[PDB]
Amino acid sequence: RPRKYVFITGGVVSSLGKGILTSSLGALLRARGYRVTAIKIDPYVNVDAGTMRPYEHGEVFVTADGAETDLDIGHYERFLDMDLSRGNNLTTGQVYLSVIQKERRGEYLSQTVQVIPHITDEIKERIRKVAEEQKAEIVVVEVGGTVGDIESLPFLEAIRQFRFDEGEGNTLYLHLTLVPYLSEEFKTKPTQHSVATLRGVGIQPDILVLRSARPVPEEVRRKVALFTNVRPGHVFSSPTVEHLYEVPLLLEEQGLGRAVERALGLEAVIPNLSFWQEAVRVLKHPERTVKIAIAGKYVPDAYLSLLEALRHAGIKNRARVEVKWVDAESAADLDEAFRDVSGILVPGGFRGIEGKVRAAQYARERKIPYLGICLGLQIAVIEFARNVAGLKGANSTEFDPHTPHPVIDLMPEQLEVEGLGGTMRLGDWPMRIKPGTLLHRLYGKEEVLERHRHRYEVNPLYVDGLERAGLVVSATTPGMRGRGAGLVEAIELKDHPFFLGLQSHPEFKSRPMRPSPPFVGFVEAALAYQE
Amino acid sequence: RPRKYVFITGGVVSSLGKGILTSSLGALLRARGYRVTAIKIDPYVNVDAGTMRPYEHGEVFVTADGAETDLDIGHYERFLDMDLSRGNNLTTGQVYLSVIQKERRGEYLSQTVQVIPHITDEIKERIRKVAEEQKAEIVVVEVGGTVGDIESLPFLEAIRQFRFDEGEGNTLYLHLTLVPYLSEEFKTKPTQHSVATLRGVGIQPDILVLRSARPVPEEVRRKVALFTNVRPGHVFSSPTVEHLYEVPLLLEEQGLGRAVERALGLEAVIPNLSFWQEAVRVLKHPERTVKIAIAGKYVPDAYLSLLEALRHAGIKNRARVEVKWVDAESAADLDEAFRDVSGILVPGGFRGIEGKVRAAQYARERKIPYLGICLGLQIAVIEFARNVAGLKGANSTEFDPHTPHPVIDLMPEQLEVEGLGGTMRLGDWPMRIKPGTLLHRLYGKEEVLERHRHRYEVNPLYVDGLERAGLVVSATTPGMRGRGAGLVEAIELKDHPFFLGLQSHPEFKSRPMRPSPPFVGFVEAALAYQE
Amino acid sequence: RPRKYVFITGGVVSSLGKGILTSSLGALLRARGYRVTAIKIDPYVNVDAGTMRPYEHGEVFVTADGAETDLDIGHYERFLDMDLSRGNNLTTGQVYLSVIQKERRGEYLSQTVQVIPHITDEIKERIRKVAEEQKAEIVVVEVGGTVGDIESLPFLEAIRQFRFDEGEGNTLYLHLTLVPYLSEEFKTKPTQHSVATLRGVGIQPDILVLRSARPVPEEVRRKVALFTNVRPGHVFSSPTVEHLYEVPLLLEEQGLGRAVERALGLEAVIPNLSFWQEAVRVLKHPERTVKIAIAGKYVPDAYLSLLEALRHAGIKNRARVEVKWVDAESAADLDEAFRDVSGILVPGGFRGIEGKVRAAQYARERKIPYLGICLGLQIAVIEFARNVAGLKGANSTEFDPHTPHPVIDLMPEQLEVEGLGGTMRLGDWPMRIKPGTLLHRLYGKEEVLERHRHRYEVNPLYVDGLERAGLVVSATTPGMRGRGAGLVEAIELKDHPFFLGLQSHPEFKSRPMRPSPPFVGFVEAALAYQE
């Protein structure tokens, strides 16, 4: 059977929730039993999100294969419930670099190389290759940027060519626009202009989705349909909502799923959205409520996946997890700052370390549930080494390269591989959990995979000592490709309600349908502490 | 004083002679005493014309610095009478590669990199850097491609930004369009639409040039002026003409030069166009006429510079040089094929060698003026080695790598430099001419520079022998950067009216104001042979 | 000296307050001593607002010359403090009808007539003719509709042609756009696209005004400036405000006035905005506060000028006039409906009459200040005739054509003029006020002009009787062109704090700088009643 392509573009302005739209349509299609995948096109020149601030100006997601991508990929994995790869984040830098390298190597056999057809060919081929390896019957492609700008032009053209290449019934085009609401009057002029510009570059949308404060009434939607050339029944609303998980349920309700099936010539399949329905029920009507503090170094979307993991966890506990932001780098005031808190979470980063060290001490001495992710584990290791192992001024050579006790340092030279020096650990790394530990109790397995993004590890040489002082290493890595063999992956304390730290980013793999165990435990313990 | 920028764009269709327009405006400005330069923007992805067919689909020009550029650069050098560099041919591949390399190296300090402002900044900086090193007061920039297409978009935007960056009075914009002529009716609709699209991307042309079979009458030009927002006096004609050298004279006549001075706030300077006037006089009223044959391997624009050199030469001889194209690779029929010919020229290339070998033999035995360029010299060396030195099956290892006598082969290992193996000789190479020779008689100097583009040289080991058989080496190279020291640059025969060959491409440096000596001699000798 | 033209266009969406923008710029220019005028272009096909609902879907303003125009004209008169004519409201119907009539009469001398130049010529000529008769040095023209739509196209083209026709320095172009505000992020994409579309039709704005919830910061304004081709200092903000009168003060503050003077090559004049400053002071800090009820038949902008008159009045009384909307057509409940009210106003119309009759009775018997406009006077006449003159079932033949007492009926046949039958009275009509009356006390003159828009008059035959029953006719009309000679223009009662009715629409001539006397009295009396 023919593979189907659903393209999604945006108009008028950006920030209309096009990523959640892509994710929501992907979920609707999966709830129908199809094998699906999503590709995020980012018109920027960056080859990948590798040279960008990992938290600062938005979170940089990390795929199982170690790719550093745009945060939308995380939205896709969570809504489609699947592992994506670096091929799912296509950028201008990738496409142009890849094409330029080919002609310098003379691979274009002496022809003059141009945006069309060469850059556009490269783009389509990349879309098909990824869809091929992930064996998808339906692939949802989101074009980043805004129709009408210069950057997305090569991509709008590339996807326009799919209609002819794939044959009738195999491609569908959706365009998301902004419909400001004043009067109680909906202003449709901007979407009329956006669609007109779109047709100008050669694309006729099949389906329109109108972003606005509230749903666009039928009368208005019909008018938009007639002046855009789109069937009235193919114009939908995208109202602002309280919970993102409402989006798919809402879109299916209006008939977007039905419209897409038909437009693609697929026989109607009744979707099973029971999960989304229950998740939204739990979200609107929590059974309980507990607040936890995030002593973060970056107090938007810097912790997108993190906050998502907590939400997936609260649902699993039928509880609304309220988040308190504690600067941490801001001194002695830990009693008030953690008063109405029942759990303390220290997330990753790469400045305010000393402030976080204090947050861990307080949580360890006051018996407050503590979860440490990436840097969060290192901090707990650092403060433990100081205040329990008596290692004066213990630290990571990241913050203090001259510390007398580098309990945390770069990849030991003994476990390093040729040509990989100075490269952090990325993507899935195997983790061997220790039976009888808290970790083991949370996961329920001995071998699991968790994603990483860091270049500092617990110094092997200080392990024996820290363990004697009471620190527990509930997990390590048998290594990978002969690298980092034996490195500590998790730590915890026995005489404590809940004190756990992991070197990986478990938020990344967290899914609404499968909460990350470390977070499920954190929220659970937090509830216990609350009484 | 402020540097001035004159941008030139094209609309409706390509192939309107925009390159000659740029060149003609550059000449008009030079005839006024200004220090000028021209930059050719080629929207293609190729980093340079290096991986393209050197002759086949158009000639690839070579600058003094060894850059392989688009052929327009040659038009610029000839009309502006100056040496340009690789910085004068800007492409999409250069700009994107250069920007992509910078962000992978993290030089963009973690920001997200985009076409605007990063790709556009790169473009403007490249335009300014080149204009800086060549100390130009006025720089004419030609944007390749056609307004309305996707590829030139980053460049149209980059140059639009110059107006603000440079301040009032320092930038001017010209747009060339097609005005079809039916009825005796001139169709202005296409240029109305082109200009409207141009304004759409943010540029308002100051000057319009209308390409058409004949000049566009004042009535029509006025109408175009009013609907485009351009002053009536700033709309000019570009009629098809017999001789390209007529273009500048024609444009100055209508007042383009005057308009540009004013628009740039420069006090009127009366241009001295005496040279162009005389050259066109000689071209329209030749004193004599001689035909010569070009036994070329590529029998358009494959020999652009070559044909230009011959024209510059004919003018210096007050004679119209008619060119006969002899396939060469097509057997025994040399009497008819060279009947009404008074000179035989064998140009460069990298197939029909055996056919050319025959053309050289005939010209040597029949006392017919012979000029050999690049391969042309090697061929003459090959046929001489065979038929005069008795070297059976002598050849170049390029055509016969197994010949028993590689009289012509790759760069001898003794004269090669580390890391430069397999790289041909490019750009200016010093040539030491031998006194008393024909070469010496033509140039009138002992040391000159000529441009190269080839990876095969006369085998040093066969020189002594060939010289004893009567071959003369009237020039060699003291080398360059310790490479190719001693290589033969030219050959000739004593008992012959005119038999000369050079390893370089002397056409490249030929200028209308300064004909290349080797060609001046060729045409002169050709005339002698004619009687 | 040359006449100056300031054109104003709108983009992205309509409803951005472009009318108040035009009015506010007009006021800024008048505060500088210039003779100004404004022209409202309405792209609709209606020849004038004559066949449109006079109140229902927005108020239809009426000029001194009896023209029924769009409501913006009222905004212009109030802000520019001047009388405009029908030539100040230009529409598509006017322009096309006028051009079509000319070619049917063969006035185009057999040429083929087209939108360009014929329709466009007609448009420019109409703009100049009106500006001529009103001797304006600066004329502000507002183009209705939204750039990007089909209807305004002929007009955008017409005004583009002014630049060339008028010469340098005499025309200026402003474009108003929507800049949505999310994040605290201002979305500039829509205005970038709007301006780009504008340039596409051939116009380059000189000044930009950005409509948004709050003022657009300098950083954002600068970015918009660079991508639109507009000087940074020529990009302004138009934030939403509490009082419209704040707009001019705000725009002058940012420097719009300064920018316009300069752009038009006029030497800086310091504007006297003392009036606007004081009016806004009084509006933000009222001395007192009184609420009055409007028993209207149309309970938006249906009473634009009406509400404006009340505001001008409250300012003159240093009091905030709160308005209560009483349906009137909705029965016995007059005590609650008028509880917290200190004045009852019955406005014009042409259904719920019986409901209004009751409102007048209550206000007359309870000694509550009463002001009747147009129908409001007739109603007071009708209820007086019934409840005081004992004329059972008295009425207007408009509501009851079969009433036994048509105290109000159409223009008496005795006072009608040939060919004017069935045509209501429009524009200024002279009114002779009677000394010693309340009317006379309010105006302070014996002869004044007030605008009309109605076809029903008080029956002359019932006057004598009503006067004996206590009704006072404090004003009549000596007629006009021999029509309606002697008709009643106003009525009132002696034994009452304030009971006054006028047949004209005094709201229409009301100005912020000169409140309409009838309203000044109403608000004053209302305050008295309040104690």
UniProtKB/Swiss-Prot annotation, chains A, B, C:
Signal sequence, start to end: none
Q: Does the keyword Membrane apply?
A: no
Activity regulation summary: Allosterically activated by GTP, when glutamine is the substrate. GTP has no effect on the reaction when ammonia is the substrate. The allosteric effector GTP functions by stabilizing the protein conformation that binds the tetrahedral intermediate(s) formed during glutamine hydrolysis. Inhibited by the product CTP, via allosteric rather than competitive inhibition.
- Annotated region Amidoligase domain: where? 1-266
- Provide this UniProt record's keywords sorted from A to Z: ATP-binding, Glutamine amidotransferase, Ligase, Magnesium, Metal-binding, Nucleotide-binding, Pyrimidine biosynthesis
What residues sit in the active site? Answer: C374 (nucleophile), H505, E507
Positions bound to ATP: S15, L16, G17, K18, G19, I20, D72, V241
Q: Does the keyword Protease apply?
A: no
* Protein residues bound to UTP: S14, K187, T188, K189, P190, T191, Q192, K223
**What pathway annotation does it carry?**
Pyrimidine metabolism; CTP biosynthesis via de novo pathway; CTP from UDP: step 2/2
Binding site residues for CTP: S14, D149, I150, E151, K187, T188, K189, P190, T191, Q192, K223
- List positions binding L-glutamine: Y55, G349, L375, G376, L377, Q378, E398, R455
Quick one: which residues bind Mg(2+)? D72, E142
Listed SUPFAM superfamilies = Class I glutamine amidotransferase-like, P-loop containing nucleoside triphosphate hydrolases
In the record, the note on similarity to other proteins reads: Belongs to the CTP synthase family.
Q: What does this protein do?
A: Catalyzes the ATP-dependent amination of UTP to CTP with either L-glutamine or ammonia as the source of nitrogen. Regulates intracellular CTP levels through interactions with the four ribonucleotide triphosphates.
Q: How does it assemble?
A: Homotetramer in the presence of UTP and ATP. Is in a protein concentration-dependent equilibrium between monomer, dimer, and tetramer in the absence of UTP and ATP.
Q: What is this protein identified as?
A: CTP synthase
